[PDB]
C-alpha cells in the first residue's frame, strides 16, 4: 500500500523553495516573480521500492509572514531547509528555522535536510565546506541542488523522506 509523508520546505525569500518544489511536482523550471504565502502539493512517488505519498508544504520566505510558521511547524514531520549559495543571510537564517522547529516540536530529533540551492551559479558566498560543517554539527544530510538544471532535486526530497521514515521506525 502507501505511507504518507508530510514535508515542509522552509528558508529565506528567493532561495528557490518554490522552484525546487515545482520541478518535482510539474517537471519544469520557471523564472518568474511569485512570492509564496503558502502552497500545498501532493505527489505519489516510489522511494526504495515502496510507493510513498508526499504532502509538500511550500512556505513563505518573506519575513512579514513569519506568524504562520508555528502552525506549519506543528503539522510537518520533516523539513527541507533551503538556502541559496550566493546569499549569506539565507545560510545564517537556517539556524533560526531549526531552533524554532525544535522549540515548537519540543524535540531535538526532528527530521530535516540541509539544501544549498542555486549551485548552477558561479556567484558563491557560502562554501560547501561551511555547509557540510553545519549539517555535520546538526547531524543531518546536506545536498547541493540546482532547481534550474534539476541537479539534486529528487535526491533532496527522497533523502528527507528517508530521514522521516527512519524517525517513524524508531
Amino acid at each position: 500500500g502507501m505511507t504518507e509523508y508530510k514535508l515542509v520546505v522552509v528558508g529565506a525569500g528567493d532561495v528557490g523553495k518554490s522552484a525546487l518544489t515545482i520541478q518535482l511536482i510539474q517537471n519544469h523550471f520557471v523564472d518568474e516573480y511569485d512570492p509564496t504565502i503558502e502552497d500545498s502539493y501532493r505527489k505519489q512517488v516510489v522511494i526504495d521500492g515502496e510507493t510513498c505519498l508526499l504532502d509538500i508544504l511550500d512556505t513563505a520566505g518573506q519575513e512579514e509572514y513569519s506568524a504562520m510558521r508555528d502552525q506549519y511547524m506543528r503539522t510537518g514531520e520533516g523539513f527541507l531547509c533551503v538556502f541559496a549559495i550566493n546569499n549569506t543571510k539565507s545560510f545564517e537564517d537556517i539556524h533560526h528555522y531549526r531552533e524554532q522547529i525544535k522549540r515548537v516540536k519540543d524535540s531535538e530529533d526532528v527530521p530535516m535536510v540541509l539544501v544549498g540551492n542555486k549551485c548552477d551559479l558561479p556567484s558563491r558566498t557560502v562554501d560547501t565546506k561551511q555547509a557540510q560543517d553545519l549539517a555535520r554539527s546538526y547531524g543531518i544530510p546536506f545536498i547541493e541542488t540546482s532547481a534550474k538544471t534539476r541537479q539534486g532535486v529528487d535526491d533532496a526530497f527522497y533523502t528527507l523522506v528517508r530521514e522521516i521514515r527512519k524517525h517513524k521506525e524508531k
Binding site: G13, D14, A67, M68, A84, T88, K89
Partner: protein, 245 residues
C-alpha cells in the same frame, strides 16, 4: 551632506541586520523631513542596476526592507481602520452554511460542498477587495509619497511594469500579512477560529494573484478562481494608479 554618508555606511551593515538598518535610516531621515530623498536614492540605486523587472528587489533588497518598514510605521492606522470592520463581520457571522472556506478537495469534509465553499470564499474576497480599492481617500499621505516615489523611480527604466510594482508591493508587504495573521498584526484582540484562519489565508492568495497580475498555475485547487482573478485585474490597476501617480 547626510545622504551620501548614509548610502556609504549602508554597505557596511550585513544583510542580517537590515531590519534594524531600515528602521534607523527611515527614522533618521523622517525626523529631518528628508524621507522622500532617502527613498528616491535607495530605490534608484537598485532600479538603475536591474536589467529586468524580474531581477529587481530580489533576494536581499535594502529598498524592500525600507518599504516594508514604511508600510508598518506609516500604514498602521489606515490598515486597522480598513480591515477591522471587515474582519468583525466574518468573525461574527451566524451562517453555518457560509462558515467554511475549504476549497482544497483533498482536505474537504464529506459533509461540505466544494462549490459552496468556493462561492463562500469568493464572496469574502469580493468584500475585502472592493473595500481596498474604495479606500484611496483614506490612504495616509506619507504612504502615498512612498508609493509614488517607487512608481516614479521604476517608471524611468521599466515604464510598463511601474504600476504592477506598486500594486505587488502594497499587497505582498502590507495588506496581505495583516489579513493572514490579524491578531499578530494587532488588529484583532484574539486569534480568529481555525475555519476563519483558513479562509483568510486562501483569500490573501487570491488578492495577491490579482495584485501581481499572475494567474493560478501551481496549486490545482486554486485555478477555479482564475476567472474571478481576471475579472478584477482592471479595477486593481485603476486603484494602484490612483495611489501611485
Amino acid at each position: 551632506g547626510e545622504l551620501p554618508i548614509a548610502m556609504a555606511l549602508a554597505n557596511v551593515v550585513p544583510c542580517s541586520q537590515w531590519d534594524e538598518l531600515a528602521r534607523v535610516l527611515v527614522t533618521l531621515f523622517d525626523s529631518r523631513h528628508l524621507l522622500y530623498q532617502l527613498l528616491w536614492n535607495m530605490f534608484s540605486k537598485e532600479v538603475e542596476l536591474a536589467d529586468s523587472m524580474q531581477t529587481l528587489f530580489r533576494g536581499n533588497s535594502l529598498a524592500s526592507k525600507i518599504m516594508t518598514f514604511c508600510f508598518k510605521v506609516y500604514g498602521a492606522t489606515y490598515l486597522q481602520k480598513l480591515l477591522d470592520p471587515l474582519l468583525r463581520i466574518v468573525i461574527t457571522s451566524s451562517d453555518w452554511q457560509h462558515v467554511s472556506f475549504e476549497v482544497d478537495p483533498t482536505r474537504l469534509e464529506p459533509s461540505e460542498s466544494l462549490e459552496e465553499n468556493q462561492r463562500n470564499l469568493l464572496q469574502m474576497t469580493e468584500k475585502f477587495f472592493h473595500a481596498i480599492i474604495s479606500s484611496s481617500s483614506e490612504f495616509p499621505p506619507q504612504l502615498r509619497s512612498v508609493c509614488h516615489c517607487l512608481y516614479q523611480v521604476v517608471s524611468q527604466r521599466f515604464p510598463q511594469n511601474s504600476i504592477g510594482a506598486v500594486g505587488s508591493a502594497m499587497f505582498l508587504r502590507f495588506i496581505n500579512p495583516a489579513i493572514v495573521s490579524p491578531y499578530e498584526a494587532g488588529i484583532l484582540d484574539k486569534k480568529p477560529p481555525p475555519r476563519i484562519e483558513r479562509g483568510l489565508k486562501l483569500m490573501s492568495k487570491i488578492l495577491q494573484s490579482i495584485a501581481n497580475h499572475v494567474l493560478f498555475t501551481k496549486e490545482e485547487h486554486m485555478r477555479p478562481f482564475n476567472d474571478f482573478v481576471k475579472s478584477n485585474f482592471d479595477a486593481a490597476r485603476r486603484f494602484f494608479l490612483d495611489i501611485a501617480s
